[PDB]
Amino acid sequence: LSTASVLAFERKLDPSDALMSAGAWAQRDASQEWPAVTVREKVDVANLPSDADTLKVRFTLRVLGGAGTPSACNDAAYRDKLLQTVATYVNDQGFAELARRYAHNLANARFLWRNRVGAEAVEVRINHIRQGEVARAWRFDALAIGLRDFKADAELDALAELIASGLSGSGHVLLEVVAFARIGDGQEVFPSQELKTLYSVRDAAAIHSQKIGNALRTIDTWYPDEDGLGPIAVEPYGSVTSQGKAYRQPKQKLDFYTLLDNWVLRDEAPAVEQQHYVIANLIRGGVFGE
């Protein structure tokens, strides 16, 4: 039972670009009609309007489901074996762990990369849109909640359950994320640089979809050696761009490719942590095989 030369997994939890606007903390209650932030020239930098102390970011999120379901697979036997292993994992334990971790990331401001730095108060509001109506809402505080530490909360558990259901394919899930960060008057935001060219849509600055989905999947906290760094964005080979060091090297058995090959072909069940990591990677998607 060799692997399939062609393997692809459609991404799940795929966000969209993140728009930016400006307003006042007092106006947070009704963000409607908030003026957008326009790119300007000096290089190019973007600062809030003359009298504006709060930044707003709005991006949607969808949950497709069928993470394990391959988009294209050369062999039927391999696909069936993989689906069986995935089903076994789901039956034994649900995605509640992944959903809870994802919920924490959404609650906190981890998606924002540089704007949060030196942010006194970041207030996030995550709604749920079903049939065009807000079924249930939640409001959290990014500053109080640990960015690098995961704490349990009733709201987080409910959100994790909803996400787990969506991933399992119970029903469609749509999440509207809205963040409010207090920086200061005339401060400078840090949008996603374009190849200095700032990313702008509809003559408005925004952040790339992938740059957000990268942070949302920071679920890799089971590396073989820990120096206290914290969670690392789930990536094959546990690579890190900023640190310039690659944890979870291929020499060890913690490698994603090795773990998946063993757990599918050789039926070697790795640690529960590794199984979570593998499911996270499958959700992220990619190209495997040859």
């Binding site: 990369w113 540089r114 730095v117 206290g228 690392i232 640190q243």
Partner: protein
């Protein structure tokens, strides 16, 4: 300084060390000059001229009462997520003599020509010719990356580390933490 506070910047994947340290310096600048105080100073214990870096940790040298209010202040706080901060600790009795300073110079001939022509009312060519190629000078010491309205790319931060001496003269420091003309405790 009877109490030493060691702020250790914890490694983070989202941000690099240079940007983090720059944010730290910027936040501290407003938290010290605006806050007041007779003597406010910090030193880089990890300072090394081989790598031309600013160090992976910082040490704020202040009095006990000064540090008591400094850490409690909201401005100086809130960055505990990426930086590990403790409480004041008495410095060791043996101490070296070190003065951290900043180097001020202009590397642009244009600024000098403009400043000269705007005072004596000279011509464009008089100011251009009067500034030769030997007038462009800038510090070559290790400069941390600070990105702000001053420069689009990473801008160098000129920090001069004083040589080690025996006699240690203390005194009031600057607002942004610049050298006030006296050394600081080196541990």
């Amino acid at each position: 300084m009877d109490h030493y506070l060691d702020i250790r910047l914890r490694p983070d994947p989202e941000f690099p060390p240079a940007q983090l340290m720059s944010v730290l310096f910027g936040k501290l600048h407003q938290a010290l000059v605006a806050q007041g105080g007779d003597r406010i100073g910090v030193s880089f214990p990890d300072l090394d001229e081989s790598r031309s870096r600013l160090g992976e940790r910082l040490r704020i040298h202040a009095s006990a009462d000064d540090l008591r209010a400094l850490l409690a202040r909201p401005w100086l706080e809130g960055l505990r997520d990426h930086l590990q901060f403790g409480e004041p600790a008495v410095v060791p009795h043996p101490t070296p003599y070190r003065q951290v300073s900043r180097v001020q110079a202009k590397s642009n001939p244009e600024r000098l020509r403009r400043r000269l022509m705007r005072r004596h009312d000279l011509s464009e060519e008089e100011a251009r010719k009067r500034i030769p190629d030997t007038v462009a000078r800038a510090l070559d010491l290790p400069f941390v990356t600070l990105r702000s309205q001053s420069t689009g790319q990473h801008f160098r931060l000129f920090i001069r580390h004083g040589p080690l001496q025996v006699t240690a003269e203390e005194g009031g420091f600057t607002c942004y933490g610049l050298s006030k003309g006296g050394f600081v405790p080196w541990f």
